[PDB]
């Protein structure tokens, strides 16, 4: 009884911004993938920290699922040991990560001809994130560390919008991402 | 009844050369990964053609398993859409591949300080292989296509040995590869 709430993960109408990534717990449930929508085709499906003795982990029966959107060229940062703005300041996996990263192109729902700017990422921060840390503040940033009031000079806004347009290359298109941690 | 022949696949003492890659069918059985070896940790675990409604394919219940050895720098050729000597002349995945590619570093058992030369690959051929095609011939090769009898000019032997040494970078180290097709 109780089927896994994978629909809430893969088929959610809205996905979070990566700076505001969301986690859902999946445990103590039966998996029925037949009640998900068809046509969710993973262009990335990469698993880390898996051993032959623990191949049963790919049944996904006890899992945390983290969801967010990035641009295509940033999907490579959702891996252990990566650097760049997403890994450093938004969503960080541990080096010893045990889990899988799934991504799929969502140009058709997440991009517009006029530009969808609803998804954001943090580009400035005082410190990189530890693994599975999350920062949701939107506080003026000063390089020197001092508190800071716009329009003061050397005072910056730490988030930047992705701009998702319908007529750009794949590296600039939106990807929904789900990271499953074996647990 | 019947526990999966995964031991035969993952735990074999000798692996095939990639030109002479081997296939094993795994179906009508229940998995017991416990008897497999601890210490087999996959440095590559990448799945292709998966969709959300087919996530259960990752239980690996009905599956062909292809095994062989390549060097580290060649593992990237074991993916859909790749070119190079291995993809072209040894082992070809189709563009529409539905399955997972697993690899792990085996310097410890497949490389020697003196050089292990038991693993081979084809480096000369007239034409690229079709997906899942296997060529185990070893007849002399002429670039003009004509029949060939060594020791004549423009006559060559089409297979080369990998040389696996203990004291080399990871790109030159041996990797055991298991490709699991959801077929």
Curated annotation (Swiss-Prot), chains A, B:
Q: What is the effect of changing residue 41 to S?
A: In strain: Isolate GD03 and Isolate SZ3; no effect on affinity with either human or palm civet ACE2
- Which consequence is recorded for altering residue 144 to A? Partial loss of human ACE2 binding in vitro
Q: Which residue range or ranges hold the BetaCoV S1-CTD domain?
A: 2-183
Q: What is this protein called?
A: Spike protein S1
The portion of the full protein included here is 320 to 502 of 1255
Which consequence is recorded for altering residue 153 to P?
In strain: Isolate GD03
- State the function annotated in the UniProt record: Attaches the virion to the cell membrane by interacting with host receptor, initiating the infection. Binding to human ACE2 and CLEC4M/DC-SIGNR receptors and internalization of the virus into the endosomes of the host cell induces conformational changes in the S glycoprotein. Proteolysis by cathepsin CTSL may unmask the fusion peptide of S2 and activate membrane fusion within endosomes.
Which cysteines share a disulfide bond? 4-29, 47-100, 148-155
Give glycosylation sites per the record: 11, 38
Instruction: Report the domain of life of the source organism.
Output: Viruses
Result when mutating residue 148 to A: Complete loss of human ACE2 binding in vitro
Q: Which organism is it from?
A: Severe acute respiratory syndrome coronavirus (SARS-CoV)
Region Receptor-binding motif: what ranges? 105-175
Annotated segments matching region Receptor-binding domain (RBD):
1-183
Q: What is the effect of changing residue 118 to D?
A: In strain: Isolate Shanghai LY
């Amino acid at each position: 009884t109780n089927l896994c709430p994978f629909g809430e993960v893969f088929n959610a109408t809205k996905f979070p911004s990566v700076y505001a990534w969301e986690r859902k717990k999946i445990s103590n449930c039966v998996a029925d993938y037949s009640v998900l929508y068809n046509s969710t085709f993973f262009s990335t499906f990469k698993c880390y920290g898996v051993s032959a003795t623990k191949l049963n982990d790919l049944c996904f029966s006890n899992v945390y699922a983290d969801s967010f959107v990035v641009k295509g060229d940033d999907v490579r940062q959702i891996a252990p040991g990566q650097t760049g703005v997403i890994a450093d300041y938004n969503y960080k996996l541990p080096d010893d990560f045990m889990g899988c990263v799934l991504a799929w192109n969502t140009r058709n729902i997440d991009a517009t001809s006029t530009g969808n700017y609803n998804y954001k990422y943090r580009y400035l921060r005082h410190g990189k994130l530890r693994p599975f840390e999350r920062d949701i503040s939107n506080v003026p940033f000063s390089p020197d560390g001092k508190p800071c009031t716009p329009p003061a000079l050397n005072c910056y806004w730490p988030l930047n919008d992705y701009g998702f347009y319908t007529t750009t290359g794949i590296g600039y298109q939106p990807y929904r991402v789900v990271v499953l941690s074996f647990e």
